[PDB]
Amino acid sequence: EVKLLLLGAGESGKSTIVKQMKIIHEAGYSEEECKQYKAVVYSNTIQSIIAIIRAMGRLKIDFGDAARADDARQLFVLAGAAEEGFMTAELAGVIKRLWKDSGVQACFNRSREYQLNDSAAYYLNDLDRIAQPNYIPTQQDVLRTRVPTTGIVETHFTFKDLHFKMFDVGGQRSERKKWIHCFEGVTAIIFCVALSDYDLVLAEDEEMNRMHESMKLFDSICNNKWFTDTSIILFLNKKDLFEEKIKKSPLTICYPEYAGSNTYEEAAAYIQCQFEDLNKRKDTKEIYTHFTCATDTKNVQFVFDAVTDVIIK
Numbered sequence: 299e300v301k302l303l304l305l306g307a308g309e310s311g312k313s314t315i316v317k318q319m320k321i322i323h324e325a326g327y328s329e330e331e332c333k334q335y336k337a338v339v340y341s342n343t344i345q346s347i348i349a350i351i352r353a354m355g356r357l358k359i360d361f362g363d364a365a366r367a368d369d370a371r372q373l374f375v376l377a378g379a380a381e382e383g384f385m386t387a388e389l390a391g392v393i394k395r396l397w398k399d400s401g402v403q404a405c406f407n408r409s410r411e412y413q414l415n416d417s418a419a420y421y422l423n424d425l426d427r428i429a430q431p432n433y434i435p436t437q438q439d440v441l442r443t444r445v446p447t448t449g450i451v452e453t454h455f456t457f458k459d460l461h462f463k464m465f466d467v468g469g470q471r472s473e474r475k476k477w478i479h480c481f482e483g484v485t486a487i488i489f490c491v492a493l494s495d496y497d498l499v500l501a502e503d504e505e506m507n508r509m510h511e512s513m514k515l516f517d518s519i520c521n522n523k524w525f526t527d528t529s530i531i532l533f534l535n536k537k538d539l540f541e542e543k544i545k546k547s548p549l550t551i552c553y554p555e556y557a558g559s560n561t562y563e564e565a566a567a568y569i570q571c572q573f574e575d576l577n578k579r580k581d582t583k584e585i586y587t588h589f590t591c592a593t594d595t596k597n598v599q600f601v602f603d604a605v606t607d608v609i610i611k
């Protein structure tokens with residue numbers, strides 16, 4: 299029996315790693331389970347397009363084509379059905395036209411200025427598929443869903459003859475008071491960090507850089523004497539989103555002293571060193587760092603395979 303505890307700031311990818319265990323070690327999500335997520339996919343989609351439209355008013359961005367104004371009105375009139383797990387052909391057309399608008403896209407490309415689900419584009423770009431009648435969420439669709447974690451979730455699964463008891467909690471500031479309820483008998487901690495968070499601010503505090511928040515938390519956890527004998531695994535997650543973002547958003551926004559280029563390898567390594575340097579006992583405390591894309595089953599399968607070997611050893 300092994301106890302794994304997933305920690306990290308909000309939206310770092312903790313719950314997604316949990317979902318992967320079911321896909322990798324279990325038979326994946328069944329049709330009935332996938333159908334349960336259909337309303338989540340729809341909710342996520344409607345919420346995302348509305349978030350952008352909301353930002354347009356805040357940032358004073360006009361629609362590319364005046365005709366979209368009518369579609370925007372219809373969006374709210376028809377939104378309700380989507381919230382109930384139903385996607386009419388009419389609603390799909392409205393969302394599709396809005397998503398393709400140049401003004402909506404201009405705002406979309408300025409998302410760091412507000413709050414937007416990372417899976418926004420994933421679903422919006424696949425509207426035709428998810429809008430089909432009798433649509434059934436794929437494994438990737440489930441993995442891409444956004445469901446805030448409040449409280450503690452316990453998941454069980456067997457791997458390499460070991461009985462894993464995996465726990466994940468909420469990462470927002472208001473949820474951290476609950477972390478201590480999971481501190482007993484932890485075999486290993488998997489601390490998740492959203493690499494693509496470097497130019498974002500906390501949803502609970504617009505004055506705090508998301509990455510700096512993750513650093514303070516890791517510093518606290520990694521150096522907690524209570525975990526001296528607990529394996530510390532560091533997941534520098536969302537490497538896929540980071541790879542694209544680093545090309546156009548200065549890392550100096552988060553780390554003023556970064557002197558490297560706008561490239562993945564140099565920046566990724568820099569961030570890794572920033573976190574690993576927080577370890578106050580480098581000689582007696584080992585940090586096992588892995589770069590991950592939590593929604594990529596193949597990546598997680600191999601990374602988790604490596605993580606389990608370390609745990610076994």
Ligand SMILES: Nc1nc2c(ncn2[C@@H]2O[C@H](COP(=O)(O)OP(=O)(O)O)[C@@H](O)[C@H]2O)c(=O)[nH]1
Nearest residue numbers: 309310311312313314441442443444536591592
């Ligand atoms: N593109 C991408 N999306 C990710 C990745 N990890 C998580 N996500 C998405 O980001 C969102 C938040 O993850 P979630 O697991 O709910 O975060 P938690 O609050 O730490 O549990 C979900 O919509 C995920 O599907 C990743 O590596 N790449």
Ligand code: ALF
Nearest residue numbers: 308309446447469
């Ligand atoms: F940390 Al979360 F949903 F934001 F589990």
Ligand SMILES: [Mg+2]
Nearest residue numbers: 312313446447
């Ligand atoms: Mg969660």
